[PDB]
Amino acid sequence: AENSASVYIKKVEARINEEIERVMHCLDKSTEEPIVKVVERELISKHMKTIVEMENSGLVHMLKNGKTEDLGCMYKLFSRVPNGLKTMCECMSSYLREQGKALVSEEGEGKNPVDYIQGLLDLKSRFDRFLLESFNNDRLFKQTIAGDFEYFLNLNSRSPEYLSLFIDDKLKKGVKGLTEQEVETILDKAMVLFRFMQEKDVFERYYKQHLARRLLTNKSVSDDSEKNMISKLKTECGCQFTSKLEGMFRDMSISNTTMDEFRQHLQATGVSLGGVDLTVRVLTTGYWPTQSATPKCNIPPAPRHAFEIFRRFYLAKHSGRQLTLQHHMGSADLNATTRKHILQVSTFQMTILMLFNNREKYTFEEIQQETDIPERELVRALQSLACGKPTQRVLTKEPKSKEIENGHIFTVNDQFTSKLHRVKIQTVAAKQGESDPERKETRQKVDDDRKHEIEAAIVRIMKSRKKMQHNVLVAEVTQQLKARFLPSPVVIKKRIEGLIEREYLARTPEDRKVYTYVA
Amino acid sequence: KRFEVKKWNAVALWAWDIVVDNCAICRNHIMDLCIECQANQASATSEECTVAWGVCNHAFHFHCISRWLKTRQVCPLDNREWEFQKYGH
Ligand SMILES: [Zn+2]
Ligand SMILES: [Zn+2]
Ligand SMILES: [Zn+2]
């Protein structure tokens, strides 16, 4: 009552020290077991409940401000009395839950995922530093913090997505932390944070999407850190999806071999003035998520000739396969022309600009009637070229408005603000919005991925194992997928009974006594 | 002209022998069920039969290729070992 949790610990430590000194110097030889036991049971066992939680700089406040000496002395004092570390870790976990809920709060739009992941990593590093400095690497504290992280991190389904965005931001360019030591430390911290994370399927899917985004754009991002990333993934994930990652890296390798060989062949042929500079790439459908490779749209004449030459070469010297045309990938360099400044089009504005070159003074009807254009990508490209543009506009209009009309004429502005000859319009890859349609479609995709993965596991494992009666093998199949994602009991229960319609371990429900151990 | 394209950085996609008109295993189609499914609704619960894609870019029904995993699995359209790289067309 006369003090608080700040100076009371030093006073009680001094009291214990003087009591033990007196008992060892002024009394008999041993004289200490019952004395120290009863002293502890009176002081610590009574002050433990109230001095760490009530108020006025107890345990939570002395940890929030970052008092290392207070934490160290509390750990060294409460370690003598049993059930002290238990409530210490309980209060620490309660504070961790409160901080996480204050940090993982979803109510409110306009949060930066990279900043959120950076703050979470900073909190984790601060707690680890406090543990190392005060708790002397106690196993109980580490277990409690690991459990607390597992408990509060999986509140929102977008946490692995935000981690993937953060790692993409750190990997795209090492502007912050030019040297390699801090990069290595931050990567180690990131993988440590990912260690206490569930739902690895969405994490891998978004990491692969980020790989596709960063490898199908301007190259020479790091050129060395990919090996470090794959090495860390091997030591963290294993050999489940890392092999496919290096496989799509080999796909990139095959692609660049194709670029150089096609350049050589175009030099050999050199028929039309459409292949001045070709940077074509060749990828496989299985590795990269290019299943939506059918935007059927018109191509500008020089790109038309280039694509025709490439297709003829690929059908002549690479027989046995056919190519598919698409527009939702790649880029281009448009040489405009007082100086000759070269623009940049990401294969979205090429058709509209080519139509403008053929005839100016067009509108929405002109670019929607004689071009065979899709719906959503048309709107996105039109908005990128016209709406929300800074003072470097390359496609202006007379009806200045936010919403898109039908009868609006398109013009072009000089905009000499570009100080170089290579000016690009990077309207794509804007602030991470993660809209509802894309989130829903990727959630459906990952749900189907899990639904096929569980079937693959059950047909790969149960062929060499025993049979189940009611719920025997489901425990094993969930344990094998414990480190992957949630067991989802209802989903697996509904899916295991769908294979009974045909052969290959039909798993008859009525005849569940024995299962068909055949093929 | 006012705007002339200098460089183009397209990406080309390709497949080995998917045969959209026919599953090389079942010879019905790349879509529209398989030999062991027949009726589309029956008792299917959203028709779990999907299209399986391997590292060898060959496409069959997931049911078509699941029956071949028991015996030799060498992707009989080539010598590559069959994998599971994509589900759904
Ligand atoms: Zn088939
Ligand atoms: Zn089927
Ligand atoms: Zn094959």
Side-chain angles (χ1 to χ4, degrees), chain A residues 6-106:
Chain A
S6 179
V7 300
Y8 161 74
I9 171 153
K10 296 296 298 180
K11 191 170 300 180
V12 70
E13 179 69 25
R15 280 293 184 177
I16 292 180
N17 283 271
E18 64 92 13
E19 175 69 25
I20 193 70
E21 197 274 337
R22 174 190 294 104
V23 79
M24 74 96 61
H25 190 279
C26 201
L27 291 191
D28 44 309
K29 67 212 160 293
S30 62
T31 188
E32 75 100 358
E33 320 286 345
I35 292 299
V36 77
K37 180 254 179 299
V38 84
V39 158
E40 289 181 0
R41 189 186 64 178
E42 284 145 23
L43 303 175
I44 307 300
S45 300
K46 288 301 181 300
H47 275 250
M48 183 183 59
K49 182 179 59 60
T50 173
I51 215 59
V52 301
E53 65 176 4
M54 180 183 61
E55 206 65 31
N56 298 330
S57 180
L59 174 63
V60 52
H61 183 68
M62 92 180 197
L63 186 61
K64 178 179 59 180
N65 49 15
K67 298 298 296 300
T68 66
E69 285 77 13
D70 294 65
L71 265 305
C73 67
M74 182 157 295
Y75 172 76
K76 82 180 60 180
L77 177 62
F78 279 80
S79 59
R80 302 181 181 271
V81 181
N83 299 331
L85 298 180
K86 186 259 301 180
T87 178
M88 200 74 52
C89 297
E90 184 267 349
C91 184
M92 181 189 58
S93 61
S94 180
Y95 170 72
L96 267 168
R97 297 284 172 78
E98 293 179 0
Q99 184 69 21
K101 264 65 178 300
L103 185 60
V104 81
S105 60
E106 191 71 22

Side-chain angles (χ1 to χ4, degrees), chain A residues 371-401:
Chain A
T371 193
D372 301 68
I373 188 81
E375 211 279 310
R376 195 161 320 94
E377 215 285 306
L378 167 53
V379 174
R380 280 179 268 168
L382 182 88
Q383 186 256 300
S384 306
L385 260 196
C387 183
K389 279 289 302 176
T391 189
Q392 295 83 31
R393 299 180 177 267
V394 300
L395 182 62
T396 60
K397 80 179 76 65
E398 287 82 6
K400 300 296 297 180
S401 61

Side-chain angles (χ1 to χ4, degrees), chain A residues 209-243:
Chain A
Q209 290 185 2
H210 297 347
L211 284 154
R213 289 296 301 179
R214 73 172 60 98
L215 294 181
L216 293 173
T217 42
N218 52 271
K219 308 295 296 182
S220 179
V221 292
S222 59
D223 300 329
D224 64 330
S225 182
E226 292 82 9
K227 302 300 179 300
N228 203 335
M229 288 296 186
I230 66 178
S231 64
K232 296 303 294 180
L233 258 296
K234 286 288 196 307
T235 63
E236 176 87 3
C237 167
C239 263
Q240 293 77 352
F241 302 125
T242 52
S243 304

